[PDB]
Amino acid sequence: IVGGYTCGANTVPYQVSLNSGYHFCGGSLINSQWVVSAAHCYKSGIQVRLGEDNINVVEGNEQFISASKSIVHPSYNSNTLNNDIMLIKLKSAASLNSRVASISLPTSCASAGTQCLISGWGNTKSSGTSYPDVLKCLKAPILSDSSCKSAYPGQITSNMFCAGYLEGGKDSCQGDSGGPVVCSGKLQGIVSWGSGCAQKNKPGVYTKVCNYVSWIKQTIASN
Numbered sequence: 471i472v473g474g475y476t477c478g479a480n481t482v483p484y485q486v487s488l489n490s491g492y493h494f495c496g497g498s499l500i501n502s503q504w505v506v507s508a509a510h511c512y513k514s515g516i517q518v519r520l521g522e523d524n525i526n527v528v529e530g531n532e533q534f535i536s537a538s539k540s541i542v543h544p545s546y547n548s549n550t551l552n553n554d555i556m557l558i559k560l561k562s563a564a565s566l567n568s569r570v571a572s573i574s575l576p577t578s579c580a581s582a583g584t585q586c587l588i589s590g591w592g593n594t595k596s597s598g599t600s601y602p603d604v605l606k607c608l609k610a611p612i613l614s615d616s617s618c619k620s621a622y623p624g625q626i627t628s629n630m631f632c633a634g635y636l637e638g639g640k641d642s643c644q645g646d647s648g649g650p651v652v653c654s655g656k657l658q659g660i661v662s663w664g665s666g667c668a669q670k671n672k673p674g675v676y677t678k679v680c681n682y683v684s685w686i687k688q689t690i691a692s693n
């Protein structure tokens with residue numbers, strides 16, 4: 471997260487870190503046994519880490535659970551990043567408490583102007599590299615479809631939405647991928663992609679979760 475603030479230990483209880491010997495992507499806990507992330511984060515041998523703050527130190531509120539099955543969206547296109555969503559099932563259910571809680575799926579799509587909370591352990595520099603060990607947070611409004619499409623000519627599909635600042639300086643970044651974009655207390659987006667990080671006129675592009683609610687519910691109910 472570029473230009474954000476330190477969330478504070480366990481203040482984003484639904485945030486998960488996907489670990490494969492190291493953190494490589496974020497994710498959101500939607501229920502005691504299912505996590506939602508970005509399809510471009512797909513990898514085998516994923517361990518889901520819940521209750522995380524400092525990912526390099528065992529602080530006492532963690533739950534390390536291996537994934538038993540990963541399901542990348544049937545229509546995921548790696549070249550365009552269209553349908554960049556993936557479901558991961560935990561081998562065992564997580565113990566939900568105040569510090570580890572699931573985030574609700576939206577019942578409707580959030581509108582432009584809505585303020586959202588974006589979080590992750592990704593790079594904090596727009597130019598250069600510095601990965602934080604504690605979770606970073608960023609408040610950012612959903613941008614209109616017009617500004618989004620104008621910022622990225624011919625790359626925005628009906629399953630993506632821009633959120634951030636056209637001025638730059640504040641944005642998600644490499645390592646935040648798969649992470650949550652919560653608006654109105656529901657999961658509205660998933661950190662997907664962007665041109666660079668915190669660049670002017672190049673806001674972050676997120677997977678529009680409301681379009682996938684049926685797919686999610688159906689898959690969870692039969693797997």
Ligand SMILES: N=C(N)c1cccc(C[C@H](NS(=O)(=O)c2ccc3ccccc3c2)C(=O)N2CCCC[C@@H]2C(=O)O)c1
Nearest residue numbers: 510641642643644647662663664665666667668673674675
């Ligand atoms: N600006 C943002 N809000 C943002 C959000 C998430 C990730 C990134 C970093 C990166 N932005 S980038 O400018 O480095 C970039 C963008 C598109 C690309 C397409 C093909 C190959 C490399 C690409 C690199 C990126 O979009 N991706 C997602 C898809 C794969 C590679 C890389 C990642 O590991 O997360 C930026």
Ligand SMILES: [Ca+2]
Nearest residue numbers: 524527528529
């Ligand atoms: Ca830890």
